[PDB]
Ligand binder design. Structure first.
Ligand code: HEM
Length: 333
């Protein structure tokens, strides 16, 4: 099983130097947590412990570079595990414009440390995986990480026991009612509960309601909006997530560059990689806040995966940013 997986990963990595662990796990038809598991005794170590305690321990290491992704978009943010509030219904690590995470901790299953050779030299990380075996979040040490605290954290949580993963499979509405309840919300954070009640996916909800609430726009909309944001210099939010973790960039888009088959943002502390041909549907949605409404661009793949979502920057108590509204208005047929 896992020896053969390790060997095969070494072969495929040599053959495909441009491809990363997630892609090679994909070529092998295994989940990424299974590739981490196979690398134990080589360049990975299993970790154990209460997930909140591990996350709290990360505050001690200082700067990290965190990667959160789905199949179609990769979000990389340099910052610190400060301002943690992990204990509620969902968890958060609240640092607008730096490391800003929203956590669904019931999805968090296994954790590994990887200390690996790469073309750019040794990299160390702590990697979290869900019950399906998919990556949730990867936390990399940088040249600024407190490596004494990093080593102390690893000694605290690394275990020699690499126990079996036991991976698991993933688990007609009234349009007038859905619409009226959407209009009646007083905060965007109620929307997920709305979907859950009506047992709807996001796109199913968007297809039900009037166009002033959810309007389909060009699949080129993300490119258009990133070009406008880069030109205009207004702050936006870029959300990229998966079933267990969403990472949120807030700030100005400094550089947008297509490269190697992806649309990239190259900012000083943040990088986005988005596979543009993966966008199957793009929606502009309007949802109420306590002060007014806000407007989002929401992107979906063919399988219905939410690739990314964008908003303007906004502080509690303020109206939606004027420039962002103007940029979105340019998308509406
Ligand atoms: C102090 C706590 C939080 C603050 C200040 C905050 C702030 C925001 C802001 C500014 C937006 C953009 C829409 C708007 O302008 O109102 C937003 C949307 C969102 N937040 Fe939060 N948030 C918080 C907690 C959370 C938590 C705990 C979660 C989930 C774990 C979360 C998940 C989201 C999601 C998914 C959206 C997009 C909603 C949609 O359009 O459907 N947030 N949040």
């Amino acid at each position: 099983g896992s020896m053969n997986h390790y060997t095969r990963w070494l072969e495929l990595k040599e053959q495909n130097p441009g491809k990363y662990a997630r892609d090679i796990a994909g070529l092998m038809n295994i989940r990424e947590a299974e590739l981490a598991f196979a690398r134990v005794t080589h360049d990975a170590w299993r970790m154990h412990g209460d997930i909140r305690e591990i996350l709290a321990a990360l505050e001690s290491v200082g700067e990290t570079k965190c990667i959160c992704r789905n199949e179609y978009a990769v979000h990389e943010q340099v910052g610190t595990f400060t301002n943690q509030h992990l204990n509620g219904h969902a968890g958060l690590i609240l640092n607008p414009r730096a490391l800003d995470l929203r956590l669904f901790l019931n999805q968090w299953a296994s954790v590994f440390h990887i200390k690996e050779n790469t073309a750019r030299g040794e990299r160390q990380s702590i990697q979290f995986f869900d019950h399906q075996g998919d990556a949730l979040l990867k936390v990399y040490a940088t040249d600024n990480t407190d490596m004494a605290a990093w080593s102390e954290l690893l000694a605290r949580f690394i275990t020699d026991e690499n126990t079996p993963l036991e991976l698991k499979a993933v688990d007609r509405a009234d349009a007038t009612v859905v619409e009226q309840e959407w209009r009646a919300m007083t905060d965007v954070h109620q929307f997920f509960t709305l979907l859950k009640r009506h047992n709807l996916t996001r796109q199913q909800a968007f297809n039900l309601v009037a166009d002033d609430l959810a309007c389909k726009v060009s699949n080129s909309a993300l490119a258009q909006i990133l070009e406008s944001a880069q030109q205009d210099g207004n702050e936006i939010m870029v959300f990229v997530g998966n079933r267990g973790c969403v990472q949120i960039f807030t700030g100005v888009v400094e550089k947008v560059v297509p490269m190697k088959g992806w649309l990239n943002i190259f900012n000083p502390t943040f990088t986005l990689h988005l596979l543009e041909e993966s966008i199957a549907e793009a929606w502009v949605t309007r949802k109420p806040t306590s002060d007014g409404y806000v407007t989002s661009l929401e992107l979906f793949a063919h399988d219905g995966t939410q690739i990314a979502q964008l908003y303007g920057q906004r502080t509690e108590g303020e109206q939606e940013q004027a420039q962002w509204r103007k940029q979105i208005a340019s998308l509406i047929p």
